[PDB]
Amino acid sequence: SMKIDVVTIFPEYLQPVRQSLPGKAIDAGLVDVAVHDLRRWTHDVHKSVDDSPYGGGPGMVMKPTVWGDALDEICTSETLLVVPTPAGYPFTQETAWQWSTEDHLVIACGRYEGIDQRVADDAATRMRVREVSIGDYVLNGGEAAALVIIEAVLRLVPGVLGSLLEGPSYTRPPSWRGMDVPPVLLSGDHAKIAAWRAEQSRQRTIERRPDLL
Amino acid sequence: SMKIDVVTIFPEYLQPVRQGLVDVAVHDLRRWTHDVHKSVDDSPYGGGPGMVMKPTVWGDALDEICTSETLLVVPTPAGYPFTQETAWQWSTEDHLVIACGRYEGIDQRVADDAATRMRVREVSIGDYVLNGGEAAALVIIEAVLRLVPGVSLLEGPSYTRPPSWRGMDVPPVLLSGDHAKIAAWRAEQSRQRTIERRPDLLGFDS
Ligand SMILES: NCc1ccc(-c2ccccc2)nc1
Ligand SMILES: NCc1ccc(-c2ccccc2)nc1
What we know:
Helices cover 31% and strands 21% of the residues of chain A. With 213 residues, chain A is of the alpha/beta class. At the A-B interface, helix 1, strand 3, strand 4, helix 3 and strand 5 of A face strand 3, strand 4, helix 1, strand 5 and helix 2 of B. Chain B: Specifically methylates guanosine-37 in various tRNAs. Chain B: Residues 187-206 are annotated as: Disordered.
């Protein structure tokens, strides 16, 4: 049973998540994803969420007063606050397994040049906070990273969504455009098949990800 | 100028992409089936759990959408790493086609056949498993498109007004107007954050 709240100035971006959720999981009360427009917590008639950086430089920084009010309303002492950022600790499969048993994730999606650092520093005095990156590239905002995190975590929760690298896979037909399925896979020698698959995995890992060796 | 075509059995998942020099189009793989059931998958040769996407339907789809100049992109956790360097490289391409798998992935002969007539790249966006390639497609599209003409270390912390908030102050050097001192402080904060969170970037363990 997990609740996820996402906060963003582009709530429409998170619509695929709500679409991916099976009715059985929702009906059984196993999962609830809610999306919130950050501008609900703005203070001025222009609904301002950003301002110029102290110390100068290009771009804009998201305002601490707006984010502080949003997180005060949505978070509790039991919340795990997730902040996607290219400057974060790495998000990996082990991270996804750890977070899959949490009761409440709140995901804070930044835009522009990111969020005033005092927002995370203040939140960390009363809840657990995790700044994370999903890979070594810069996006326009945190929304696409939030989609990846939500999918990787929820597929590990029982019944919600419905080392070495993996080697190649095959199915029918046995011959296609001049290429045959490797005959060992049709041999009925299942110890030999497992050894063949292990070697394919070793070779693919050497070629594509030597860091893993 | 870039065209991006995405092929998927869940075209609705690609909706967030709606955010003149670039065009993105989304195609339902089932358009290229021929049976009434529109079957795209079958059990794996050699055993194992799950299902594999059939090569026949994929071959017909890519025949229609791709040319010899196409860069065919296939997201997979078993791929070469997609990084900022990759994004710069792909930013000057005329035509990307992104093939999104589901189930346990796509029959390997699809990529092998395509490679006889165009350039093919199997890539991973990070070390985690998804239920399909669609979310990875969205990450790749965003990282590439922001670099298209006409559109190291970790960055340190940023701040904006007010200078004091909830009893927490913006670092005084940032209010001092001293460009040399500010540059030096920011360089230090970046290198400090990098050794703490990403020691691999500076050539250290873990
Ligand atoms: N994990 C990769 C990642 C995450 C977040 C952002 C991002 C970009 C702009 C503003 C705020 C966050 N970029 C990359
Ligand atoms: N780059 C990470 C990544 C990419 C693709 C997939 C995936 C999952 C299931 C089926 C087909 C592709 N998973 C993770």
